[PDB]
Amino acid sequence: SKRPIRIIQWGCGLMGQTLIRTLREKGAELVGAIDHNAARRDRDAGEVAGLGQSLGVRIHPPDQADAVFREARADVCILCTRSIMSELAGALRVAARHGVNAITIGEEAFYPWTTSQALTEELDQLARANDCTLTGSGFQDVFAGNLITVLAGATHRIDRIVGLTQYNADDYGSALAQKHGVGLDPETFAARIGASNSPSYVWNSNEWLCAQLGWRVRDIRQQLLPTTHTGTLRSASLGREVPAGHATGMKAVVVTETHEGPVIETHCVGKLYAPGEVDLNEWTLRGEPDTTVTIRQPATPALTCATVLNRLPQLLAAPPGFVTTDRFTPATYVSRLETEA
Amino acid sequence: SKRPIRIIQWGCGLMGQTLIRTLREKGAELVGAIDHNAARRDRDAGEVAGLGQSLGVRIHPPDQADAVFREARADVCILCTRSIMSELAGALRVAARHGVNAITIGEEAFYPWTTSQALTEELDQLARANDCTLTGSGFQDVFAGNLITVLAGATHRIDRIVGLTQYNADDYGSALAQKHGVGLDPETFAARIGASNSPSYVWNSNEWLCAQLGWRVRDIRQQLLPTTHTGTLRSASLGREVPAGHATGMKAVVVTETHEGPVIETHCVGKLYAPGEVDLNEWTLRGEPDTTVTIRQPATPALTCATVLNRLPQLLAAPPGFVTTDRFTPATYVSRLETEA
Numbered sequence: 115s116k117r118p119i120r121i122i123q124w125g126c127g128l129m130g131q132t133l134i135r136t137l138r139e140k141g142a143e144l145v146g147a148i149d150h151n152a153a154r155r156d157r158d159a160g161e162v163a164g165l166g167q168s169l170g171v172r173i174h175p176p177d178q179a180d181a182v183f184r185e186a187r188a189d190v191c192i193l194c195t196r197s198i199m200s201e202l203a204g205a206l207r208v209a210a211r212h213g214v215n216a217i218t219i220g221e222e223a224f225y226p227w228t229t230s231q232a233l234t235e236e237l238d239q240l241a242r243a244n245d246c247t248l249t250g251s252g253f254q255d256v257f258a259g260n261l262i263t264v265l266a267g268a269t270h271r272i273d274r275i276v277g278l279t280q281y282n283a284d285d286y287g288s289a290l291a292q293k294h295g296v297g298l299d300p301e302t303f304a305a306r307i308g309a310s311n312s313p314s315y316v317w318n319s320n321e322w323l324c325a326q327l328g329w330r331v332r333d334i335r336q337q338l339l340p341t342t343h344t345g346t347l348r349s350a351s352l353g354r355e356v357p358a359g360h361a362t363g364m365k366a367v368v369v370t371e372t373h374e375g376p377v378i379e380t381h382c383v384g385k386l387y388a389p390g391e392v393d394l395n396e397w398t399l400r401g402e403p404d405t406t407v408t409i410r411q412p413a414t415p416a417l418t419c420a421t422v423l424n425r426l427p428q429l430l431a432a433p434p435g436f437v438t439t440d441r442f443t444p445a446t447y448v449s450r451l452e453t454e455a
Numbered sequence: 456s457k458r459p460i461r462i463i464q465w466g467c468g469l470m471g472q473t474l475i476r477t478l479r480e481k482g483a484e485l486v487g488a489i490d491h492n493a494a495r496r497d498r499d500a501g502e503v504a505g506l507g508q509s510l511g512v513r514i515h516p517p518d519q520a521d522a523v524f525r526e527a528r529a530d531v532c533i534l535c536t537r538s539i540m541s542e543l544a545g546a547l548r549v550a551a552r553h554g555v556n557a558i559t560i561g562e563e564a565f566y567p568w569t570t571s572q573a574l575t576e577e578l579d580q581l582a583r584a585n586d587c588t589l590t591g592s593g594f595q596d597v598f599a600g601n602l603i604t605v606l607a608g609a610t611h612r613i614d615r616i617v618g619l620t621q622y623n624a625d626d627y628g629s630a631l632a633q634k635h636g637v638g639l640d641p642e643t644f645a646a647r648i649g650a651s652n653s654p655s656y657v658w659n660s661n662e663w664l665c666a667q668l669g670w671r672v673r674d675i676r677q678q679l680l681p682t683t684h685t686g687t688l689r690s691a692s693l694g695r696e697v698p699a700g701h702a703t704g705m706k707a708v709v710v711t712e713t714h715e716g717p718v719i720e721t722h723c724v725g726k727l728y729a730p731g732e733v734d735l736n737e738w739t740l741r742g743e744p745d746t747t748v749t750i751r752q753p754a755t756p757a758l759t760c761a762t763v764l765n766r767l768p769q770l771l772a773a774p775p776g777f778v779t780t781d782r783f784t785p786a787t788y789v790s791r792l793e794t795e796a
């Protein structure tokens with residue numbers, strides 16, 4: 115027989131709400147929900163996710179996470195909270211301590227082996243010790259990952275891979291807007307965002323490409339610059355107007371050099387959109403031959419969530435540890451989130 | 456403890472010439488060459504492939520194929536000759552009888568399990584008896600194959616996959632132009648091409664998609680129509696002028712219906728090009744979300760040959776038999792075509 119995959123949603127904001135709705139559509143069961151947001155604490159997860167029915171799954175604050183793991187008998191925790199390993203590791207450790215597989219959309223977690231080596235190695239040991247799998251997925255998994263490596267499989271010689279990924283700061287929560295300097299004046303942007311130069315999502319996803327292609331990274335250079343508009347734009351996530359000339363978000367340019375020779379140059383743009391702007395995804399493999407792929411207006415949030423749910427059967431089957439998706443076969447379409455009973 | 460992969464090129468026309476040059480750039484060695492073409496017979500394969508320096512590999516006629524396989528001690532035979540299994544079987548039997556892995560760009564061979572079931576089962580048993588693997592690859596492997604299934608892994612619900620593939624009937628040899636009815640008057644086209652309704656490349660590649668997605672085919676419907684131009688066009692492959700109103704090639708529409716419900720609808724055009732026409736590759740996964748992917752002017756011949764060479768390490772490692780690429784992980788970029796001792 116088959117049974118529902120049993121999921122704990124940790125982070126019940128925009129992406130977590132989409133996942134609660136879509137996991138139920140595919141026959142999975144929400145068995146726990148954790149969020150620290152004062153407005154969502156104590157509410158039913160079905161209500162917060164916009165469903166027509168109460169699920170009888172109360173949103174618990176993270177200080178009660180152990181009790182929800184013990185009670186829930188979950189197969190997997192999906193973690194949609196923060197972007198950087200230091201801010202994900204706490205939740206991933208709770209999942210691993212309970213022997214529960216976890217998959218996060220936190221962008222650094224896609225490939226954190228060099229940017230947060232100590233935390234990743236510690237979680238890898240802890241996941242191995244508790245016979246469960248931790249991984250990072252989301253939009254990058256295909257759209258800055260296997261889309262490129264599938265095309266590399268048809269390429270004679272790669273000299274350079276050149277990428278552009280653009281997403282709408284207002285499709286996501288305050289964390290993403292903050293990381294992108296949305297609403298900062300030019301000086302504060304340069305001082306807080308530019309100067310600290312924290313790895314953009316494509317620093318890690320470029321490393322993921324090199325790992326899957328069998329290349330060794332020899333140098334990484336990133337520049338973070340503010341984006342701008344000629345008019346006022348509004349950030350719904352931060353609930354403030356952004357004057358013309360203030361940062362509407364940021365453009366990251368990452369150049370990843372290899373010992374082998376090929377280079378990966380990726381532009382990563384997260385900003386408020388002026389009228390008629392849309393998400394972009396375009397890659398060129400330069401060499402023999404040159405190949406250019408364009409996704410026409412990728413539905414970035416939907417593609418992020420669908421990839422996570424399609425990964426779950428593989429996550430359940432995966433060997434224990436912190437296992438990044440460069441070590442998996444590509445996500446396949448799964449009609450039903452049901453598992454052998 | 457590694458050595459060059461040893462290749463026999465069977466078919467030294469346009470694709471075979473590209474393969475002889477490219478295989479060497481990736482570290483493989485040409486150990487045999489077969490072609491029935493009176494103009495290439497007895498010439499050096501390096502010379503025919505446009506190299507500056509002779510390789511000391513004479514092109515042999517296929518009546519001498521056994522003797523060249525016995526001498527060559529090949530790892531792989533690349534077969535670039537004909538399109539349909541009945542016309543490839545002769546060469547695939549020679550490869551298999553000599554324990555040599557074979558990969559063909561013959562379009563039916565991509566997924567021949569239902570269109571040529573008996574030949575496929577016969578070759579499977581012959582390959583298993585000789586500890587070697589036969590497979591079909593080429594442009595379809597990614598561009599009507601794993602490009603679609605990688606995007607399916609980011610999709611919540613698939614209702615329909617709709618594809619358009621257009622290629623230049625003049626980039627390939629006479630066999631492809633003939634399969635497409637190039638230069639036929641409308642009556643002869645109807646009588647020979649339209650009426651027989653032989654499987655277009657996307658009949659087999661849509662079956663390949665269903666196999667990889669875990670769908671069961673319930674019906675396949677194809678219509679073949681001639682393409683036309685308003686002016687005379689020239690086929691370099693046939694050395695023929697094609698007057699306005701004669702078939703410049705053919706457009707296939709294949710609708711592949713599954714038991715599960717999703718449908719794959721693929722439009723496939725192979726023809727002579729009027730001024731400004733280019734190759735096209737565009738796919739839409741309709742459902743949730745809708746995703747459209749476009750390849751800008753794919754370098755279809757270069758992509759065909761590069762995919763074949765990238766597949767070779769997998770072909771060597773593959774279990775014995777007729778093993779279609781739906782059973783492999785996607786082709787990966789290979790810098791070095793080497794194998795153990």
Ligand SMILES: NC(=O)c1ccc[n+]([C@@H]2O[C@H](COP(=O)([O-])OP(=O)(O)OC[C@H]3O[C@@H](n4cnc5c(N)ncnc54)[C@H](O)[C@@H]3O)[C@@H](O)[C@H]2O)c1
Nearest residue numbers: 125127128129149150151194195196197219252253286287
């Ligand atoms: N493709 C991708 O990988 C991808 C795409 C979408 C979003 N993201 C990332 O995922 C995260 C969530 O995005 P979102 O748009 O849903 O944001 P959101 O702000 O709408 O977030 C979900 C919730 O997480 C809560 N939260 C944060 N830290 C928590 C913790 N330790 N414990 C409990 N609750 C916690 C917040 O209160 C919020 O309610 C962000 O870091 C974003 O950058 C990644």
Ligand SMILES: NC(=O)c1ccc[n+]([C@@H]2O[C@H](COP(=O)([O-])OP(=O)(O)OC[C@H]3O[C@@H](n4cnc5c(N)ncnc54)[C@H](O)[C@@H]3O)[C@@H](O)[C@H]2O)c1
Nearest residue numbers: 466468469470490491535536537593594627628629630631
């Ligand atoms: N992506 C793909 O899968 C793909 C793309 C390119 C070509 N093809 C197919 O592959 C074939 C080769 O294409 P090409 O452009 O190299 O054509 P080509 O005419 O240049 O082919 C090479 C030569 O093979 C010879 N040949 C045919 N049958 C033979 C046999 N039994 N023994 C020895 N030699 C034989 C022919 O005389 C021909 O000149 C065509 O049928 C074409 O339709 C498929």
